[PDB]
User: Fold DNA repair AND recombination protein rada from Pyrococcus furiosus.
Amino acid sequence: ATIGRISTGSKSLDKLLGGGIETQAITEVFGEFGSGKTQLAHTLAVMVQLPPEEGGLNGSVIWIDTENTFRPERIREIAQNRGLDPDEVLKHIYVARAFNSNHQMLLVQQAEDKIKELLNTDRPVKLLIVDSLTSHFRSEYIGRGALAERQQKLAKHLADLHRLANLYDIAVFVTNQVQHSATLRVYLRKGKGGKRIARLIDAPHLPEGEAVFSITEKGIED
Ligand SMILES: Nc1ncnc2c1ncn2[C@@H]1O[C@H](COP(=O)(O)OP(=O)(O)OP(=O)(O)O)[C@@H](O)[C@H]1O
Ligand SMILES: [Mg+2]
Assistant:
């Protein structure tokens, strides 16, 4: 019942987040193309595998990929440069490509089976990524009347995700490209000098500053 926190790799971003992204919660990162959403996802997929005194949860990962932007060699690089075995780290990320939004929804149901399989194991699922949460919905539900229909399907999908996060004490991390029912929304944008900036949105009771980070051979870090 106590929540867990997964470090992002960036001390700055971690502080903004109160220590890292939370289990029993959906964290949505949103921003324009190139703002670092997928790179943050790759980094979290390594960080969660660390022990807790290093900011992880000794956990496995389920990743639902909608745009085929998952890169196993990037996982291996991030792992290697953080002192972890690249191939063991990869072994604990279960990637499924979602062919369309309906398949994406079924995949969340299959994720529950894998979650059960690894539960009470030494590396239970502690992170579930959906990258991108919205891309299929955006292409499939379009035109007059689509707004209500799309929002309803997305709400159902997010309800499924919330249930997994809460039932099994998992952190859910979803991405959304810009030009809501997530627990926490984090807006990401590219700044000067290769920096990325993060801001919490519509969360008046949480830190109101901005975090600043870089994307490196370690994934994300200050
Ligand atoms: N190995 C690396 N080292 C340093 N920077 C990198 C590396 N790989 C990617 N990047 C940076 O990450 C950027 C891409 O970030 P990312 O794919 O997370 O964007 P995104 O927000 O997911 O975009 P979209 O919405 O288009 O999918 C690149 O333009 C580059 O600046
Ligand atoms: Mg991306």
The chain has seven helices and eleven strands. The pocket of adenosine-5'-triphosphate (ligand 1) is lined by residues 31, 33-39, 177, 215-216 (CB under 6 Å). Residues 1-222 form a domain with the Rossmann fold fold (CATH 3.40.50.300).
